[PDB]
Design an enzyme around this catalytic site. Structure first.
Site, mmCIF file in Angstrom:
data_model
loop_
_atom_site.group_PDB
_atom_site.id
_atom_site.type_symbol
_atom_site.label_atom_id
_atom_site.label_comp_id
_atom_site.label_asym_id
_atom_site.label_seq_id
_atom_site.Cartn_x
_atom_site.Cartn_y
_atom_site.Cartn_z
ATOM 1 N N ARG B 104 0.774 -1.225 0.000
ATOM 2 C CA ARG B 104 0.000 0.000 0.000
ATOM 3 C C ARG B 104 0.808 1.279 0.000
ATOM 4 O O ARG B 104 0.475 2.204 -0.735
ATOM 5 C CB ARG B 104 -1.022 -0.010 1.140
ATOM 6 N N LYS B 139 2.117 25.228 -4.739
ATOM 7 C CA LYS B 139 0.891 24.675 -4.268
ATOM 8 C C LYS B 139 1.089 23.175 -4.263
ATOM 9 O O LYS B 139 0.462 22.456 -5.032
ATOM 10 C CB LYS B 139 -0.239 25.080 -5.181
ATOM 11 N N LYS B 171 4.090 39.205 -5.013
ATOM 12 C CA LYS B 171 2.698 38.852 -5.108
ATOM 13 C C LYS B 171 1.748 39.980 -4.719
ATOM 14 O O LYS B 171 2.172 40.993 -4.183
ATOM 15 C CB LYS B 171 2.459 37.620 -4.232
ATOM 16 N N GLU B 200 4.362 39.738 -10.027
ATOM 17 C CA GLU B 200 3.030 39.347 -10.429
ATOM 18 C C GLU B 200 2.130 40.583 -10.703
ATOM 19 O O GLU B 200 1.977 41.470 -9.838
ATOM 20 C CB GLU B 200 2.496 38.495 -9.284
ATOM 21 N N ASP B 221 -1.237 37.391 -14.062
ATOM 22 C CA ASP B 221 -2.243 36.746 -13.261
ATOM 23 C C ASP B 221 -3.675 36.867 -13.733
ATOM 24 O O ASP B 221 -4.291 37.919 -13.667
ATOM 25 C CB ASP B 221 -2.127 37.217 -11.812
#
Ligand SMILES: O=P(O)(O)CP(=O)(O)O[C@H]1O[C@H](COP(=O)(O)O)[C@@H](O)[C@H]1O
Ligand SMILES: O=P(O)(O)CP(=O)(O)O[C@H]1O[C@H](COP(=O)(O)O)[C@@H](O)[C@H]1O
Ligand SMILES: O=C(O)c1ccccc1C(=O)O
Ligand SMILES: O=C(O)c1ccccc1C(=O)O
Ligand SMILES: [Mn+2]
Ligand SMILES: [Mn+2]
Ligand SMILES: [Mn+2]
Ligand SMILES: [Mn+2]
EC number: 2.4.2.19
Lengths: 284, 284
Positions: B104, B139, B171, B200, B221
């Site tokens: 597994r 992410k 950002k 960004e 973006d």
């Protein structure tokens, strides 16, 4: 919300997350653009609808970066809340540098867990008006089992075993090695008589062979709906106490169809191995 | 195949995986059904088509459970191989008890990493005949960044930054704190002049404002295709050296349309945050 080992699991995950972010140096861009004394009010808001889960993990991520007394929660939603696009799941006030550094790790955990709880709930709604419960599997990501498991519970499903010694589950590879499902069942019963026993069958034939042995649960592996109907009919007449669980060819489109046959559970791997993130952003 | 840090990461992941399975007691069903002297030939075979990645991790899982001299690999496919349903990715000969216990954990990793490499390759094929490269993001799942990052590369993608101090990336929240994109850009330039800088932008207006500053990369973006085309036209005329990266409203259905605009990269979060497992089984 989280229990002790879940909380410990969360702490270990957020620590690994932050370490992945910080091992190449500090957050140069945050350090350079925002002063240490800066402070803001920010909100974790969903860009989409779903069920929320893992909000406490957001708080643990901040505790790790800012310390318990480094931030204030002005408002929050409860885990398991069904939520629309644009909903503020939590409003905080905290040192800006801490938030920008913690942002990604905390958002990555909350989006993953919310994605699972949102999926789980979909499955739970699909089989509503039926007696079937949705269960998970051990097809979890290494290091996140306690959290992924917590998330399916939040969405309404019920956890299956957490590990290998947790409960017995005789699989196809065991039956192969033991030479027969009834042989294997007998062996497991003799060795661990106090342990829950689940036997996995691949056919109606094996099904007929194990019903008389009366195992706790029988897992119908990859049965067509018509075979699942027969199975339930046989169980109901021969061994009313044996629980039946469907696993294998399960899609959200067929969930109700299987549930309608009268099975007790649907075990869904997808719930933890193919999760779509719930899109959440940190808004300042 | 795996580098040193990837190897250390894999080892850490496999260890966390095994601990989750064994923390409730030993594999009671295997100990009871299969003898210690049992040995089989087993194959990891795909139930579906896709690109394979993470096979070395399977080996590392066996080393950990059976020890180096506990098994023999009769045959294996190479990581990155395009594979059909029913293909045998690796054929081993090993102590049965060890295989069933490792099964597994190794399957969950190989399946995860392959699902990523499979998705990456679809994006890569989509922008074929274009100069755009597919890149990932931060992410990623906590504790699995190195491995997930390894998998997109196996699928044909190109890694973006691995962490926060790796490269600079201005950002929305930084811009908010700095009060302006140009301000923020200037600040980072002063603090880490030797570090690659990506800024960004949310609008053609911010685009115009930052082009003259000549940052290393500009992340468009959530731009529509028409806005992406315009941006490529402005970059080409005003700052030929500035690289453009699309990120935000990207779907595999639109990938080529955006790539055709002439952007250098497509940054895809789904590649690592919404992965569908490649279904793989251990057949004895
Ligand atoms: O195909 P097998 O020979 O039964 C091997 P496998 O590792 O798939 O065995 C497990 O997977 C299914 C779990 O739910 P899902 O299918 O959604 O992932 C179920 O069949 C399990 O006993
Ligand atoms: O929506 P924002 O206000 O830009 C916050 P977010 O955390 O989404 O910011 C990141 O996500 C996108 C990453 O690729 P994907 O969309 O596929 O996940 C991209 O916009 C990034 O700068
Ligand atoms: O992970 C699995 O193979 C699994 C799949 C379906 C039911 C239960 C399990 C389990 O072992 O608990
Ligand atoms: O994770 C993100 O927000 C992200 C998204 C797209 C590109 C790069 C990144 C990054 O920070 O490296
Ligand atoms: Mn199975
Ligand atoms: Mn299967
Ligand atoms: Mn963004
Ligand atoms: Mn977004």
């Amino acid at each position: 919300g989280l229990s002790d080992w879940e909380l410990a699991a969360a702490r270990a995950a957020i620590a690994r997350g932050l370490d992945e972010d910080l091992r190449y140096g500090p957050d140069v861009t945050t350090l350079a653009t925002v002063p240490a004394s800066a402070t803001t009010t920010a909100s974790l808001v969903t860009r989409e609808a779903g069920v929320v889960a893992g909000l406490d993990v957001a708080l643990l991520t901040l505790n790790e970066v800012l310390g318990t007394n480094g931030y204030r929660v002005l408002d929050r939603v409860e885990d398991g809340a069904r939520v629309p696009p644009g909903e503020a799941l939590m409003t905080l006030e905290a040192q800006t540098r801490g938030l920008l550094t913690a942002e990604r790790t905390m958002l990555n955990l909350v989006g993953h867990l919310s994605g699972i709880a949102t999926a789980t709930a979909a499955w739970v709604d699909a089989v509503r008006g039926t007696k079937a419960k949705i269960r998970d599997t051990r097809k979890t990501l290494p290091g996140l089992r306690a959290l992924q498991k917590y998330a399916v519970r939040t969405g309404g499903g019920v956890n299956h075993r957490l590990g290998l010694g947790d409960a017995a589950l005789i699989k196809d590879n065991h039956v192969a090695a033991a030479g027969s499902v009834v042989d294997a069942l007998r062996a497991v019963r003799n060795a661990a008589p106090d342990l829950p026993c689940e036997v996995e069958v691949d056919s109606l034939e094996q099904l007929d062979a194990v019903l008389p042995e009366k195992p706790e649960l029988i897992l119908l592996d990859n049965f067509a709906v018509w075979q699942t109907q027969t199975a339930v009919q046989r169980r109901d007449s021969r061994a009313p106490t044996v629980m039946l669980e469907s696993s294998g060819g399960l899609s959200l489109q067929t969930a109700a169809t299987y549930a309608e046959t009268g099975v007790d559970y649907l075990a869904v791997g997808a719930l933890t191995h193919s999760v779509r993130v719930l899109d959440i952003g940190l808004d300042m």
